[PDB]
Design a protein around this ligand. Sequence first.
Ligand SMILES: Nc1ncnc2c1ncn2[C@@H]1O[C@H](COP(=O)(O)OP(=O)(O)O)[C@@H](O)[C@H]1O
Ligand SMILES: Nc1ncnc2c1ncn2[C@@H]1O[C@H](COP(=O)(O)OP(=O)(O)O)[C@@H](O)[C@H]1O
Lengths: 154, 596, 345, 152, 97, 132
Amino acid sequence: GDFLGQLITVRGIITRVSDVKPAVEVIAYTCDQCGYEVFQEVNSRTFTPLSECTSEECSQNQTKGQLFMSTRASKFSAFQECKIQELSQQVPVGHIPRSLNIHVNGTLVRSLSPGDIVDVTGIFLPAPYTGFKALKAGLLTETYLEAQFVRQHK
Amino acid sequence: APDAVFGDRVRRFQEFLDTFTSYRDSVRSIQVYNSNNAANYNDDQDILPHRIIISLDDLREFDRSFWSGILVEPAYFIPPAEKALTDLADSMDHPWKLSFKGSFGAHALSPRTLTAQHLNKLVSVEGIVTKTSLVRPKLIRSVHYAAKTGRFHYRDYTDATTTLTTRIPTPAIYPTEDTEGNKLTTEYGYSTFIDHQRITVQEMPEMAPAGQLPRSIDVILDDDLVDKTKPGDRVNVVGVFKSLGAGGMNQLIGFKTLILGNTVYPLHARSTGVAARQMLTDFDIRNINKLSKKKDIFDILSQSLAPSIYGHDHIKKAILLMLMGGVEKNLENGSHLRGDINILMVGDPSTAKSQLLRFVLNTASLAIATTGRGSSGVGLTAAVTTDRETGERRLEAGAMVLADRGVVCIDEFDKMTDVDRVAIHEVMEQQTVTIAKAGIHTTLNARCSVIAAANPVFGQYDVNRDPHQNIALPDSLLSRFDLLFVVTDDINEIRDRSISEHVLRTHRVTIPFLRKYVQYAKERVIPQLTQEAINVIVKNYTDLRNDDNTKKSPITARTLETLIRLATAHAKVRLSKTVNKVDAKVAANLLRFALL
Amino acid sequence: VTMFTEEEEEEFLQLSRNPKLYEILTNSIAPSIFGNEDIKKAIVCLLMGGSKKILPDGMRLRGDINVLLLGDPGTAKSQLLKFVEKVSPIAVYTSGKGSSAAGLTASVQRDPMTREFYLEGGAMVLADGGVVCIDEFDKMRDEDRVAIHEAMEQQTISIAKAGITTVLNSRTSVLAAANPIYGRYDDLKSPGDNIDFQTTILSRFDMIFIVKDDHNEERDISIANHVINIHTGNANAMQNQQEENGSEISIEKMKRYITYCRLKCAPRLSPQAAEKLSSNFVTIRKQLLINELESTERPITIRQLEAIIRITESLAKLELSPIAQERHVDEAIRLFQASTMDAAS
Amino acid sequence: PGVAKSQLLKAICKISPRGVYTTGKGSSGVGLTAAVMKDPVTMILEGGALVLADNGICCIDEFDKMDESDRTAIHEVMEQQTISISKAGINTTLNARTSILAAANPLYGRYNPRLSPLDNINLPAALLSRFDILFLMLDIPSRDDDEKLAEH
Amino acid sequence: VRKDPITKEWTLEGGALVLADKGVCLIDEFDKMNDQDRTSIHEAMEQQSISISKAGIVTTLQARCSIIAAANPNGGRYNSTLPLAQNVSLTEPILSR
Amino acid sequence: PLRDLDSEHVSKIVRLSGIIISTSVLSSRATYLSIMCRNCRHTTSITINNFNNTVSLPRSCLSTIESESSMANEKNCGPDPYIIIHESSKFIDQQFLKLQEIPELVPVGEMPRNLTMTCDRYLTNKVIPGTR
Ligand SMILES: Nc1ncnc2c1ncn2[C@@H]1O[C@H](COP(=O)(O)OP(=O)(O)O)[C@@H](O)[C@H]1O
Ligand SMILES: Nc1ncnc2c1ncn2[C@@H]1O[C@H](COP(=O)(O)OP(=O)(O)O)[C@@H](O)[C@H]1O
């Protein structure tokens, strides 16, 4: 846990590949009174819709608008993830292999069949998450890896 | 500024730290090696933590007051001694923690009887490692870049676990929009992190009563101490029993407890884990080098392993050789070639068959006694996890999985059903176990050595009817086992005489020297085959196919693979590097008594 | 409770130096059961526990002995085994392998809360350093019999189930009591012919006794009218109270007496008694050699000598001295010959 | 047994892409086919090894000791792409471009000419009719064949 | 040891032979009783005391019942000239007790 | 007997006898403790005897109630400021057994009943469950 933020190279076995579904990144919002477009960037797991308007022209006025989002103007992203099991050759003599979560985004999706041997390189970032509520020691960081390049053996 | 109390604990311990110079050369070797560790990494191309073992010996013969204060209230003497120790690290040339090794009859009690007494003290607890949690890193120091000003910043965060003293808690929100309104863009990498782990320890089953509900506590580890234990061992733990939390008096019982400031010591079991921590002095190896210069020590080691058993000379010779294990040469981009040796014996009862087995267990290292059935998890892991943290499937390492680089003791081999015998072909030949259930198909490695023991089918009829089908075993299991020893029921008077005074003197060079001589030969004695090793066994193996088939059966090329292993393990005993013809002369004789 | 007072030591020492001590304890077990005087002897030496050698040699031996009580129903051996638990400080009575809810072998049950592995129970873990009573050894289920076939040799039942790989200690003492098929017809066949599997089970034991039933009309009245007096008006129990004035003052005193006898003394035989056994063990094996070759068909073991050698320390633990004598050994050969007269014929 | 067939069985699924090494009992009749479990973060059909090793070669040990229901699926592969399911809520007929290599051992004893073909075989000939190519691994101890193999 | 669906805690539930101490129990159809039942009846007429070895509990509860039977012949209403132990499908020690 | 425990037996010296089911896992209450006001820096100490809900930490910094001029002359520790300094406190045991009525007499029509136990300091770790 000292290699956080570095650029690394791992290998293993693709195991329990998920499905590809779009990840919403930014959401457009039509004013319908002031005629602007409001934009909200979300980097969290969940989020909320926002208030009736946040224009500069609907502001400083008595009657603010009431908005709603739109689909075709938003930006999405290809999203799918999987888990990598240990290579089962460098494992110590009495151990059980672990796993690791890797998020995949964008172009490189639909390129990893399950049950293979692959070199995955990427950069090592945490995710804000802790386990059970009572077991929290106060700053518990759950990690992952973001995929950058695929080089497959075989 | 510190008070008078804090410096006096320093200067008194600094007086002790100046008293004994043995720990001075210890930290010296720590600094010089890690300097040389960074020296080779940064000169051609163009690990160790900070803790030192201090015994609980010398404090009684130096300061009985400072002895006593640690053993009751450790939360006053541990910080200044470390501060004084970090002074020594900085003066002679980062936490710089310690061990507190030492045996004491004060607080070595069971964890079963630990609660509500001796709180806020230092307690040594041993027991069983179970349900090991996941390894997580911990956030300490955040780094933030402001865009327009173009500078970095500084921010730390602390928790109550590390400090060991109840300090006023000051939480701080993770920063955004600090001074004027520039965006605090986050960074990483330079932000520091330290790993973290929590585990539970069940008490000893051998110390436990007959049957009652076991009760346990928890231990949280630290940075250099994450993940030293797999779940299922016997480990001594030395630390401080601390109770935190507001015990329900805020607004039905609080005051949950834990133990921090810890050192971890795995200890040998009867049948679990490593026993290879046995030291070797220069005085020790000089005796071995004086021993290995002889010509007949194989006989003496053969006669040594029957301390209370008469006879069975050629049986004992192989038991040396299985613990030698043969040589392993995995091919370049091919497969491994199996090196260990597996033996089954058979004979009439009350003929030292059960007088052999625990002697194989106790003398060897990492052995597991497997008795009767082996159903559902001996060769397997069964993947039964209903883990409450997340829906997932993990493994619990079975005995055949657990006995890797070791010996499996199989008792009453004939009573095994055909179900697990499917796995034995997989274990003994491909040295791997693949488990494919609907959750996750897996593949693992286990290269155990196997000794089993089966009876005859009916009566003592070992020689009367026919040598074939005294066992009525499947056909490949003949090919799985290397040597098949048959023990007779020879009735005599001279032989009875040798039985007579043996048992009489029983009820009215050594073993601990032996296992030093054994485990030394593993890491430096592997030999390599020479030209003289070919010419005998080529002539000999043709005789094994042409004339043994006129007497018994079967003869496969797998038998010749064992002929390599016998000359291999014999060269390990003499600690030679080449392979001599005499090793084959020993190995050729071993087949004759085993079969004919 | 290990330690105790000084006057209880002294009243042991008074009972210690009595030369009628073997006789008075072999009149102590069953005044309620008439006859079976050799069975009346063999119970005592089993309840003492033999030597235990923890040599620098890599193994230890076993101390306890095992006796079979194969024979006809009506023996009141059921009444006998109840009295064995009354003598023993800790003991487990089992009828078959199955109790109503209690298993017998080393069961490991996972805790339904917390999903924790622990030792559930059985019998051999419970009676460690004690007495095991098993009825119906041949009317018995056979899925875990192998665990019984190991405990009587190493006193250490190992468990290698899915969770743990532990080896425990279990220094129990098993009393077997088999049941022959067709009663007295088992002695009309060859003297085996009871266990349907084989008689190599019997070779792993020490003492084998056969219960007979021979009609004798004067003995028929004596075996009757002994026991009518037991039932009503407690007359023999009142006759015990005048024997209590002269002999065997309590059961529970003798219970405490055996516990002091067991853990304190460290007995050992004499080397001139060894040459008596070597002159005896060969000639019986020579007699078994003669009865084999002249009858041209087929069992004695070396564990039979292991059975012989341990009766001395049981009698020495009666005698409380750490040494042995010649007649101190020769009494057992007479009793062991009673264990081998059931064997051959 | 002394032909060391499993030396080749591990070697074939190693070089060949999409190669899954399988055993007899370690997969049951439900293991190597699909299964239904609750999906994590993103009720899909979690597949088995033959579901995995499609457009590839499955290495199979000890077909003699399979389940009899596990034999029925193997006959359903000899007609291509067919895996029928009639379980509690699943009616799927999933597809599979797999390839089959099998290796079973003969009967007790070894090569009796008094025994016939199908006498020393533990499988019906309708399954043998589905096998286009069959080999036999003889072991005749011959004097001249050894010296090259010994030098080998 | 069972829990109660009315109440969820573990409650010890002794048998009817545990219940009928100084009472008379009435049990029939012995042929349709398991080996679980058969070891229980064997121990109950043996020493009048039932021992248990459940989860963290090892006790010996007593039982002083009196057993009255109601059997069913095997096949015929009265099989042959063969005796009752040959007529019945049960075993010898329960016949002795 | 356990069958008849009326409301007239509330908070009275009543004895009984039964069968103990199973114990619990030992927790710990506290008796003596030193606290601190997180603003005022005000320390006191609290002892308790009848620990068998009863008491909790107060909700005023309590330095305001002082019979000295210069200390009361020198704000708000409020809200409830007290944080227990755990390094010099004192602790006890709490057991929570569970007992069941003896099934030999009258549980015929019903299911057996039970109650809930709690023992003090030297009474813990005493009885193996099941005995009479
Ligand atoms: N050659 C011998 N020398 C000394 N003791 C022996 C010898 N052969 C057998 N024994 C005795 O046999 C006993 C072990 O019986 P064993 O044959 O191991 O059991 P099993 O045949 O049931 O596996 C030991 O107590 C040992 O004293
Ligand atoms: N010599 C005797 N003295 C006293 N009671 C006897 C004697 N012989 C038999 N009994 C009676 O025999 C009964 C025991 O039967 P038993 O033979 O032990 O049954 P099993 O051995 O078939 O379990 C007891 O009730 C006991 O009263």
